[PDB]
Scaffold this active site. Structure first.
Site, PDB file in Angstrom:
ATOM      1  N   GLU A  35      -3.308  -5.988  13.991  1.00  0.00           N
ATOM      2  CA  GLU A  35      -3.774  -5.876  12.609  1.00  0.00           C
ATOM      3  C   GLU A  35      -3.025  -4.793  11.850  1.00  0.00           C
ATOM      4  OE1 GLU A  35      -5.638  -7.729  10.908  1.00  0.00           O
ATOM      5  OE2 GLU A  35      -6.691  -8.944  12.410  1.00  0.00           O
ATOM      6  N   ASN A  46      -4.795  -9.421  -0.077  1.00  0.00           N
ATOM      7  CA  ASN A  46      -5.047 -10.831   0.179  1.00  0.00           C
ATOM      8  C   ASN A  46      -4.880 -11.633  -1.107  1.00  0.00           C
ATOM      9  OD1 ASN A  46      -5.933 -10.268   2.918  1.00  0.00           O
ATOM     10  ND2 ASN A  46      -7.851  -9.528   2.018  1.00  0.00           N
ATOM     11  N   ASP A  48      -6.890 -13.626  -2.609  1.00  0.00           N
ATOM     12  CA  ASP A  48      -8.038 -13.604  -3.507  1.00  0.00           C
ATOM     13  C   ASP A  48      -8.175 -12.299  -4.276  1.00  0.00           C
ATOM     14  OD1 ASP A  48      -8.943 -11.897  -1.565  1.00  0.00           O
ATOM     15  OD2 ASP A  48     -10.622 -13.149  -0.920  1.00  0.00           O
ATOM     16  N   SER A  50      -8.695  -9.352  -2.823  1.00  0.00           N
ATOM     17  CA  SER A  50      -9.258  -8.347  -1.951  1.00  0.00           C
ATOM     18  C   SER A  50      -8.130  -7.666  -1.184  1.00  0.00           C
ATOM     19  CB  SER A  50     -10.246  -8.991  -0.981  1.00  0.00           C
ATOM     20  OG  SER A  50      -9.591  -9.968  -0.188  1.00  0.00           O
ATOM     21  N   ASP A  52      -7.254  -5.461   2.635  1.00  0.00           N
ATOM     22  CA  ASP A  52      -7.664  -5.060   3.973  1.00  0.00           C
ATOM     23  C   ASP A  52      -7.220  -3.626   4.235  1.00  0.00           C
ATOM     24  OD1 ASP A  52      -8.516  -7.657   4.309  1.00  0.00           O
ATOM     25  OD2 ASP A  52      -6.848  -8.246   5.601  1.00  0.00           O
TER      26      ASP A  52
END
Ligand code: CL
Ligand code: CL
Ligand code: CL
Ligand code: CL
Ligand code: NA
Length: 129
Positions: A35, A46, A48, A50, A52
């Site tokens: 990750e 991301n 959309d 958003s 991380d």
């Protein structure tokens, strides 16, 4: 902070992740490697809108507040920036909520695609825990 493999394994073990919800420590180390490459400061945006955050790439759509993901949830009740700290406590505590929500570690796409079904014990081999 960029953790060493065994350094992060020991930090995760002391924060209670070993066998948490049945996931052995190697699963968590493997997920962090793919990750974030063990980097607490990793961020990725991301499609959309958003983002991380952190060593486990926790998503602002559901789990933390970053002030720029409209209509999103803050289920860990933390600012997303707290997930970038050299101290992994906030990331671990939030990850425990995620893994308990019914879908287990499948919430982490890199875990599903690169750790699930592999010999994850290899990620803690040689470490003094
Ligand atoms: Cl393991
Ligand atoms: Cl927001
Ligand atoms: Cl820590
Ligand atoms: Cl599970
Ligand atoms: Na949010």
């Amino acid at each position: 902070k960029v953790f060493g493999r065994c350094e992060l394994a020991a930090a995760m073990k002391r924060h209670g992740l070993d066998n948490y919800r049945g996931y052995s420590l190697g699963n968590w180390v493997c997920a962090a490697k793919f990750e974030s490459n063990f980097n607490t400061q990793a961020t990725n945006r991301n499609t959309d809108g958003s983002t991380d955050y952190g060593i486990l790439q926790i998503n602002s759509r559901w789990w933390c507040n970053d002030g720029r993901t409209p209509g999103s949830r803050n289920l860990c009740n933390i600012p997303c920036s707290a997930l970038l700290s050299s101290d992994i406590t906030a990331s671990v505590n939030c990850a425990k909520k995620i893994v308990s929500d019914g879908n287990g570690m499948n919430a982490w796409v890199a875990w599903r695609n690169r750790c699930k079904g592999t010999d994850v014990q290899a990620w803690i081999r040689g470490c003094r825990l």
